[PDB]
Amino acid sequence: GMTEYKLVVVGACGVGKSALTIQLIQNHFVDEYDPTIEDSYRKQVVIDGETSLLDILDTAGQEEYSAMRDQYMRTGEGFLLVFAINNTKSFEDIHHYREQIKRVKDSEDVPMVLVGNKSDLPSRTVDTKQAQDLARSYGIPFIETSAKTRQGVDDAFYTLVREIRKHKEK
Ligand SMILES: *CCC(=O)N1CC2(CCN(c3nc(N[C@H](CC(=O)NC)CC(C)C)nc(-c4cccc(N5CCOCC5)c4)n3)C2)C1
Ligand SMILES: Nc1nc2c(ncn2[C@@H]2O[C@H](COP(=O)(O)OP(=O)(O)O)[C@@H](O)[C@H]2O)c(=O)[nH]1
Ligand SMILES: [Ca+2]
Protein backbone atom coordinates (compact mmCIF):
# COMPACT_ATOMS: atom_id res chain seq x y z
CA GLY A 1 0.00 0.00 0.00
CA MET A 2 0.87 3.67 0.31
CA THR A 3 0.40 6.53 2.74
CA GLU A 4 0.03 10.23 2.06
CA TYR A 5 1.47 12.84 4.41
CA LYS A 6 0.73 16.58 4.44
CA LEU A 7 3.90 18.44 5.46
CA VAL A 8 4.57 22.15 6.06
CA VAL A 9 7.98 23.81 5.91
CA VAL A 10 8.21 26.96 8.04
CA GLY A 11 10.92 29.36 9.13
CA ALA A 12 12.31 32.80 8.48
CA CYS A 13 13.11 34.24 5.07
CA GLY A 14 16.31 32.88 3.60
CA VAL A 15 16.84 29.86 5.88
CA GLY A 16 16.57 27.42 2.92
CA LYS A 17 12.93 26.28 2.95
CA SER A 18 12.62 26.23 -0.85
CA ALA A 19 16.13 24.78 -1.28
CA LEU A 20 15.30 21.91 1.10
CA THR A 21 11.98 21.25 -0.58
CA ILE A 22 13.52 21.29 -4.07
CA GLN A 23 16.33 18.99 -2.93
CA LEU A 24 13.66 16.53 -1.79
CA ILE A 25 11.43 16.78 -4.89
CA GLN A 26 14.07 17.38 -7.65
CA ASN A 27 17.22 16.03 -5.98
CA HIS A 28 19.41 19.07 -6.69
CA PHE A 29 20.38 22.44 -5.21
CA VAL A 30 18.76 25.67 -6.42
CA ASP A 31 20.55 28.93 -5.59
CA GLU A 32 17.76 31.28 -6.54
CA TYR A 33 14.07 30.77 -5.93
CA ASP A 34 11.55 33.63 -5.91
CA PRO A 35 10.84 34.36 -2.19
CA THR A 36 7.26 35.37 -3.06
CA ILE A 37 6.32 31.92 -4.42
CA GLU A 38 4.31 30.03 -1.83
CA ASP A 39 3.04 26.72 -3.14
CA SER A 40 2.47 23.08 -2.31
CA TYR A 41 4.44 20.34 -4.05
CA ARG A 42 3.68 16.63 -4.37
CA LYS A 43 6.39 13.98 -4.38
CA GLN A 44 6.36 10.20 -4.23
CA VAL A 45 9.21 8.63 -2.26
CA VAL A 46 9.77 5.39 -0.34
CA ILE A 47 10.20 5.57 3.44
CA ASP A 48 11.16 2.49 5.44
CA GLY A 49 9.91 0.29 2.60
CA GLU A 50 6.48 1.94 2.16
CA THR A 51 5.56 4.11 -0.81
CA SER A 52 4.95 7.58 0.59
CA LEU A 53 3.23 10.46 -1.16
CA LEU A 54 4.33 13.81 0.26
CA ASP A 55 2.21 16.94 -0.08
CA ILE A 56 4.54 19.74 0.97
CA LEU A 57 3.68 23.36 1.60
CA ASP A 58 6.69 25.60 1.18
CA THR A 59 5.69 28.78 3.06
CA ALA A 60 6.71 32.09 1.54
CA GLY A 61 5.50 35.55 0.59
CA GLN A 62 5.44 38.93 2.27
CA GLU A 63 1.83 38.53 3.50
CA GLU A 64 1.08 38.22 7.24
CA TYR A 65 -1.73 35.83 6.35
CA SER A 66 -2.20 33.31 3.54
CA ALA A 67 -5.27 31.22 2.72
CA MET A 68 -2.91 28.43 1.70
CA ARG A 69 -1.03 28.63 5.01
CA ASP A 70 -4.34 28.69 6.89
CA GLN A 71 -5.49 25.54 5.07
CA TYR A 72 -2.25 23.63 5.68
CA MET A 73 -2.07 24.79 9.31
CA ARG A 74 -5.47 23.13 9.81
CA THR A 75 -4.87 19.95 7.74
CA GLY A 76 -1.06 19.66 7.83
CA GLU A 77 0.04 16.60 9.80
CA GLY A 78 3.68 17.57 10.34
CA PHE A 79 5.82 20.69 10.43
CA LEU A 80 9.48 21.26 9.63
CA LEU A 81 10.83 24.06 11.83
CA VAL A 82 13.72 25.43 9.81
CA PHE A 83 16.41 27.82 10.92
CA ALA A 84 19.83 28.63 9.47
CA ILE A 85 22.78 27.86 11.74
CA ASN A 86 24.37 31.20 10.72
CA ASN A 87 21.31 33.32 11.58
CA THR A 88 20.53 33.77 15.27
CA LYS A 89 17.23 35.57 14.72
CA SER A 90 15.98 32.67 12.56
CA PHE A 91 16.63 30.39 15.57
CA GLU A 92 14.92 32.83 17.96
CA ASP A 93 11.99 32.89 15.53
CA ILE A 94 11.48 29.10 15.90
CA HIS A 95 9.55 29.67 19.14
CA HIS A 96 7.01 31.88 17.34
CA TYR A 97 6.41 29.30 14.61
CA ARG A 98 5.90 26.48 17.15
CA GLU A 99 3.59 28.63 19.27
CA GLN A 100 1.37 29.42 16.29
CA ILE A 101 1.18 25.81 15.12
CA LYS A 102 0.22 24.58 18.61
CA ARG A 103 -2.54 27.20 18.89
CA VAL A 104 -4.21 26.36 15.57
CA LYS A 105 -4.03 22.63 16.36
CA ASP A 106 -5.21 23.22 19.94
CA SER A 107 -2.71 20.56 20.93
CA GLU A 108 0.67 20.33 22.63
CA ASP A 109 1.50 17.15 20.68
CA VAL A 110 1.97 18.07 17.01
CA PRO A 111 4.53 16.22 14.86
CA MET A 112 7.49 18.52 14.28
CA VAL A 113 11.17 18.33 13.50
CA LEU A 114 13.71 21.03 14.25
CA VAL A 115 16.02 21.56 11.27
CA GLY A 116 19.32 23.42 11.45
CA ASN A 117 20.05 24.17 7.80
CA LYS A 118 23.20 25.47 6.04
CA SER A 119 25.38 23.09 8.09
CA ASP A 120 28.01 23.33 5.31
CA LEU A 121 28.75 26.98 6.21
CA PRO A 122 31.80 27.64 8.44
CA SER A 123 30.55 30.81 10.15
CA ARG A 124 27.87 29.47 12.46
CA THR A 125 26.26 31.66 15.12
CA VAL A 126 23.78 29.14 16.59
CA ASP A 127 25.42 26.47 18.75
CA THR A 128 24.43 22.83 18.23
CA LYS A 129 23.86 22.61 22.01
CA GLN A 130 21.20 25.36 21.92
CA ALA A 131 19.29 23.59 19.15
CA GLN A 132 19.61 20.16 20.77
CA ASP A 133 18.34 21.60 24.08
CA LEU A 134 15.47 23.43 22.38
CA ALA A 135 14.40 20.27 20.56
CA ARG A 136 14.79 18.46 23.91
CA SER A 137 12.41 20.97 25.54
CA TYR A 138 9.91 20.58 22.67
CA GLY A 139 10.17 16.77 22.74
CA ILE A 140 10.99 16.58 19.04
CA PRO A 141 13.87 15.40 16.87
CA PHE A 142 16.67 17.72 15.76
CA ILE A 143 18.29 17.10 12.34
CA GLU A 144 21.21 19.10 10.92
CA THR A 145 20.99 19.66 7.18
CA SER A 146 22.50 21.30 4.16
CA ALA A 147 20.35 21.88 1.09
CA LYS A 148 23.58 22.72 -0.77
CA THR A 149 25.32 19.35 -0.18
CA ARG A 150 22.06 17.43 0.49
CA GLN A 151 23.48 16.31 3.87
CA GLY A 152 20.57 15.24 6.10
CA VAL A 153 17.77 16.34 3.74
CA ASP A 154 16.03 12.96 3.40
CA ASP A 155 16.62 12.40 7.13
CA ALA A 156 14.76 15.63 8.00
CA PHE A 157 11.71 14.81 5.89
CA TYR A 158 11.64 11.05 6.61
CA THR A 159 12.08 11.69 10.35
CA LEU A 160 9.06 14.00 10.18
CA VAL A 161 7.04 11.25 8.46
CA ARG A 162 8.04 8.81 11.23
CA GLU A 163 6.86 11.36 13.84
CA ILE A 164 3.53 11.62 12.00
CA ARG A 165 3.19 7.82 11.99
CA LYS A 166 3.63 7.73 15.79
CA HIS A 167 1.06 10.50 16.24
CA LYS A 168 -1.51 8.72 14.05
CA GLU A 169 -1.11 5.61 16.24
CA LYS A 170 -2.47 7.51 19.27
C1 LIG B 1 11.24 35.64 2.57
C2 LIG B 1 9.84 35.03 2.59
C3 LIG B 1 9.56 33.81 3.47
O4 LIG B 1 10.09 32.74 3.21
N5 LIG B 1 8.77 33.97 4.51
C6 LIG B 1 8.04 35.13 5.06
C7 LIG B 1 7.34 34.14 5.99
C8 LIG B 1 5.88 33.81 5.62
C9 LIG B 1 5.42 33.06 6.86
N10 LIG B 1 6.09 33.82 7.94
C11 LIG B 1 5.58 33.93 9.17
N12 LIG B 1 4.37 33.40 9.41
C13 LIG B 1 3.84 33.49 10.64
N14 LIG B 1 2.64 32.99 10.91
C15 LIG B 1 1.81 32.26 9.95
C16 LIG B 1 0.40 32.87 10.02
C17 LIG B 1 -0.56 32.36 8.94
O18 LIG B 1 -0.34 32.58 7.75
N19 LIG B 1 -1.64 31.75 9.41
C20 LIG B 1 -2.63 31.24 8.45
C21 LIG B 1 1.77 30.78 10.36
C22 LIG B 1 3.17 30.14 10.42
C23 LIG B 1 3.83 30.02 9.04
C24 LIG B 1 3.10 28.77 11.11
N25 LIG B 1 4.52 34.10 11.62
C26 LIG B 1 5.74 34.62 11.39
C27 LIG B 1 6.44 35.26 12.42
C28 LIG B 1 7.83 35.11 12.54
C29 LIG B 1 8.53 35.75 13.56
C30 LIG B 1 7.86 36.56 14.47
C31 LIG B 1 6.48 36.73 14.39
N32 LIG B 1 5.87 37.55 15.28
C33 LIG B 1 6.19 37.30 16.70
C34 LIG B 1 5.66 38.47 17.53
O35 LIG B 1 4.24 38.63 17.36
C36 LIG B 1 3.93 38.86 15.97
C37 LIG B 1 4.40 37.65 15.14
C38 LIG B 1 5.81 36.08 13.36
N39 LIG B 1 6.24 34.54 10.16
C40 LIG B 1 7.36 34.44 7.49
C41 LIG B 1 8.30 33.04 5.56
N1 LIG C 1 25.43 27.43 1.87
C2 LIG C 1 24.12 27.08 1.86
N3 LIG C 1 23.23 27.94 1.31
C4 LIG C 1 21.91 27.63 1.27
C5 LIG C 1 21.45 26.36 1.85
N6 LIG C 1 20.11 26.32 1.69
C7 LIG C 1 19.74 27.47 1.06
N8 LIG C 1 20.82 28.23 0.79
C9 LIG C 1 20.82 29.56 0.15
O10 LIG C 1 20.12 30.46 1.02
C11 LIG C 1 19.35 31.38 0.26
C12 LIG C 1 17.89 31.26 0.65
O13 LIG C 1 17.39 29.96 0.31
P14 LIG C 1 15.83 29.74 0.03
O15 LIG C 1 15.63 28.30 -0.32
O16 LIG C 1 15.35 30.83 -0.91
O17 LIG C 1 15.27 30.14 1.48
P18 LIG C 1 13.73 30.43 1.88
O19 LIG C 1 13.55 31.91 1.76
O20 LIG C 1 13.73 29.93 3.31
O21 LIG C 1 12.89 29.62 0.92
C22 LIG C 1 19.58 31.04 -1.20
O23 LIG C 1 20.56 31.93 -1.75
C24 LIG C 1 20.09 29.62 -1.18
O25 LIG C 1 20.95 29.31 -2.27
C26 LIG C 1 22.48 25.49 2.45
O27 LIG C 1 22.17 24.40 2.97
N28 LIG C 1 23.76 25.91 2.41
CA1 LIG D 1 11.19 30.29 -0.52
Query: From edge to edge, which strands make up the β-sheet containing 50-58?
Result: 39-47, 50-58, 2-10, 78-84, 112-117, 142-144
Task: Please say whether the beta carbons of 88 and 129 come within 8 A.
Answer: no
Is CATH 3.40.190.10 the classification given to domain 3-168? Answer: no
Residue at 151: amino acid letter:
Q
Ligand closest in space to the Cα of 21: 2
In terms of DSSP bridges, do strands 50-58 and 39-47 run parallel, antiparallel, or are they unpaired? antiparallel
Way it was determined: X-ray
159 lines ligand 2 (CB under 6 A): no
152 lines ligand 2 (CB under 6 A): no
Bridge partners (DSSP) of residue 117 are 84
Closest-CA residue, ligand 1 atom 17, reads 65
The DSSP-derived string for 20-70 is HHHHHHHSS--S---TT--EEEEEEEEETTEEEEEEEEE---S-S--HHHH
List the resolution, Å: 1.6
